[PDB]
A paper describes a structure:
With their low catalytic over-potential, [[name]]-hydrogenases represent excellent models for a regenerative and likewise economically feasible H2 production. Theoretical studies suggest that the most probable PT pathway comprises of strictly conserved residues E282, S319, E279, and C299 (from surface to H-cluster, numbering corresponds to [name]), including two protein-bound water molecules (Wat826, Wat1120 4XDC19, chain B) located between E279 and C29915,16,20. In this study, site-directed mutagenesis (SDM) is used to investigate the PT pathway of two [[name]]-hydrogenases, namely [name] and HydA1, which represent the largest (M3) and smallest (M1) type of monomeric [[name]]-hydrogenases, respectively.
Corresponding to earlier crystal structure data, for all [name] variants a space group of P1 21 1 was observed with two copies in the asymmetric unit cell (chain A and B). The strongest impacts were achieved when replacing E279CpI for A or Q, or C299CpI for A or S, resulting in activities <1%. The conformational differences between E279QCpI and wild-type [name] are insignificant, except that the carboxamide group of Q279CpI is slightly twisted relative to the original carboxyl group. The conservative variant E279D retains 10–30% of H2 release activity but exhibits a significantly stronger down-shift in pH optimum than the largely inactive variant [name].
Author numbering: 2 to 580
Write the structure that this text describes.
């Protein structure tokens, strides 16, 4: 093929779109609705408009290159068309970037600036109440910002295959939302927030908990605990122009103290707790044979997927609470026993890469004696904004350490945020528990990686067992619908709703398509976690000295006694009722 782009001749045999061929040859072409190798097929934004000689204006994002094509990407006719489309989008967009939560990284704003587009009539709604949906515990919608680009809809389909995010006809007008415009929580939605990640603007956001936190911080009698998820220390640095894959663990501990938090702990400690219970439970299920398989229960997105699509598997879920919930349980019980604080005055806050974590924390039964396990959950984005609002020079901060009591963690807990992380961490303890030894080789590389469905055969106590790691909610459906579950007897299965693991969560920092092309965001973030595991002395959850002291002095033996009573949570399919 011979391609002419802006007077430059190209000789290629590649079969691809004009947009991507231009991107591969450093030729600038704008784009909006195009994401994850798909565009808005029904109402194309036409921001990727280029001029093909002999044909006219075409959309470069979905037009294959052909031999003899003469393309102009920066002609006048092209730029006026693109400027016209952006202007029309501004006519339905509340253009007030000042208080907006996408101010520092909004794809639309940089398109408005690039083409210097102005609205024919400034969209200024008198009352955003009808445009805004804040009924969910995880998601919020602001349709004053929605461009109707369909990226959220496509993302939902690709990532979860639930199609919970739909195009809707709201009284003659086209909008996006849940089925029948219901609250997302009341539908088959997983609350994974992958639709947020795909949104170029502030139309989709997480359900804010920042008022919960700030009100608790300012309350004199409240002792506010904060504990961040594995993925946060590998991600939040992106929002401070520090690049990708930068371990900023120490900076976060310091920033949290300057924010006024009363105690700095870590969810990775709770991750070690989850492994303690789960690995013990796995050994229990082996000696009992059943119920197999055992599924992980730490991902609330997967829990909702099970509840909404596979309720017969609810009993097969691990009884062990998620690292977030199992931490919060101990924060209201164990922590006061070693501090003297009044449990009612304890306020536990977590920092999560996940929007579904907010729903899990607000589950009615996720409490004890009137005390919530987790009082508030803020996303990686929310913490970052909280830091910038306090004008904390994050990139200039010294590394400080967390408080050890519930802040120490092994390398096993560190890799939780990556796909296959929980599986590998659980095997490190389950093997040592069953064989009653301290095994040297603990690296399970075969369950790592970005493959959708990963299986492995493991040898536990002179017996072989089949494990599986499900990477992404869509791959759960594939694993079940295709009958892969029945090819062999699986004993232990990890499931994560977000592909790549929690590092690709819905509460994670946004990454513009032009950095996604150059950076493998899922591997680069996960690398930080794996590097920590490699450099740590303790790489097994049961070697967590702070955790061992907690169990020895308070809980006793894992999987039984008081631990089984308050650190566990079982999901049950609804009792029979009719209708
Ligand atoms: N609870 C919990 Fe988890 C832990 O530890 C986080 O905290 Fe995850 C992360 N990062 C999230 O959100 S949840 C699913 N298990 C894998 S990692
Ligand atoms: S979504 Fe983007 S363009 Fe719209 S107001 Fe917010 S920052 Fe500005
Ligand atoms: S909510 Fe966001 S991703 Fe979905 S159509 Fe609107 S602007 Fe596009
Ligand atoms: S939270 Fe997940 S399941 Fe729900 S609409 Fe968004 S992408 Fe779909
Ligand atoms: S994989 Fe992690 S971030 Fe994604 S829904 Fe599950 S718990 Fe939340
Ligand atoms: S980016 Fe090509 S039509 Fe929208
Ligand atoms: Mg205070």
């Amino acid at each position: 093929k011979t391609i002419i782009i802006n007077g430059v001749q190209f000789n290629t045999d590649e079969d691809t779109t004009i947009l991507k061929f231009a991107r591969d040859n450093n030729i600038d072409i704008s784009a909006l609705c195009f994401l994850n190798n798909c565009n808005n097929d029904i109402n194309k934004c036409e921001i990727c408009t280029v001029e093909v000689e002999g044909t006219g204006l075409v959309t470069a994002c979905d037009t294959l290159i052909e031999d003899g094509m003469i393309i102009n990407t920066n002609s006048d006719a092209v730029n006026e068309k693109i400027k016209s489309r952006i202007s029309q989008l501004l006519d339905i967009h509340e253009f007030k970037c000042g208080p907006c939560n996408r101010r520092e990284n909004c794809e639309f704003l940089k398109l408005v600036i690039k083409y210097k587009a102005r609205a024919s009539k400034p969209f200024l709604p008198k009352d955003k109440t009808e445009y805004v949906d804040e009924r969910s515990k995880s998601l919020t919608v602001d349709r004053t910002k929605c461009l109707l680009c369909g990226r959220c809809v496509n993302a939902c389909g690709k990532n979860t295959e639930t199609y919970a995010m739909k195009f809707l006809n709201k009284n003659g007008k086209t909008i996006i939302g849940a089925e029948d415009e219901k609250c997302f929580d009341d539908t088959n939605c997983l609350l994974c927030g992958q639709c947020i990640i795909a949104c170029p603007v502030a139309a989709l956001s997480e359900k804010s908990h920042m008022d919960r936190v700030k009100n608790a911080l300012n309350a004199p009698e409240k002792h506010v605990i904060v504990a961040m998820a594995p993925s946060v220390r590998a991600s939040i640095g992106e929002l401070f122009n520090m690049g990708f894959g930068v371990d900023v663990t120490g900076k976060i501990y310091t920033a949290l103290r300057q924010l006024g938090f009363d105690k700095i702990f870590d969810i990775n400690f709770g991750a070690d707790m989850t492994i303690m219970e789960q690995a013990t439970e796995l050994v229990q299920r082996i000696e009992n044979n059943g119920p197999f398989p055992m599924f992980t229960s730490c991902c609330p997105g997967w829990v909702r997927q099970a509840e909404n699509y596979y309720p017969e598997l609810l009993n097969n879920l691990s009884s062990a609470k998620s690292p977030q919930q199992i931490f919060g349980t101990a924060s209201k019980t164990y922590y006061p026993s070693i501090s003297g604080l009044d449990p009612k005055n304890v306020f536990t806050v977590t920092v999560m890469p996940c929007t579904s974590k907010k729903f899990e924390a607000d589950r009615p039964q996720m409490e004890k004696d009137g005390l919530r396990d987790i009082d508030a959950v803020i996303t990686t984005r929310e913490l970052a904004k909280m830091i910038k609002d306090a004008k904390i020079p994050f990139a200039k901060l010294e590394d400080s350490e967390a408080d050890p009591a519930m802040g120490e963690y092994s390398g096993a807990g560190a890799i939780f945020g990556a796909t296959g992380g929980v599986m590998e961490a659980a095997l490190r303890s389950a093997k040592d528990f069953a064989e009653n030894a301290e095994l040297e080789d603990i690296e399970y590389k075969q369950v790592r990686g970005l493959n959708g469905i990963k299986e492995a055969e493991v040898e536990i106590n002179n017996n072989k067992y089949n494990v599986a790691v499900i990477n992404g909610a869509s791959n759960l459906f594939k694993f079940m619908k295709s009958g892969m579950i029945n090819e062999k007897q699986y004993h232990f299965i990890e499931v994560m709703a977000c592909h790549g693991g929690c590092v690709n969560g819905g509460g994670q920092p946004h990454v513009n398509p032009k950095d996604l092309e150059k950076v493998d965001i899922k591997k680069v973030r996960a690398s930080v976690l794996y590097n920590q595991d490699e450099h740590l002395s303790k790489r097994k959850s049961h070697e967590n000295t702070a955790l061992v002291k907690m169990y020895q002095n308070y809980f006793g033996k894992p999987g039984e006694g008081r631990a089984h009573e308050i650190l566990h949570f079982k999901y049950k399919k609804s009792a029979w009722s009719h209708p």
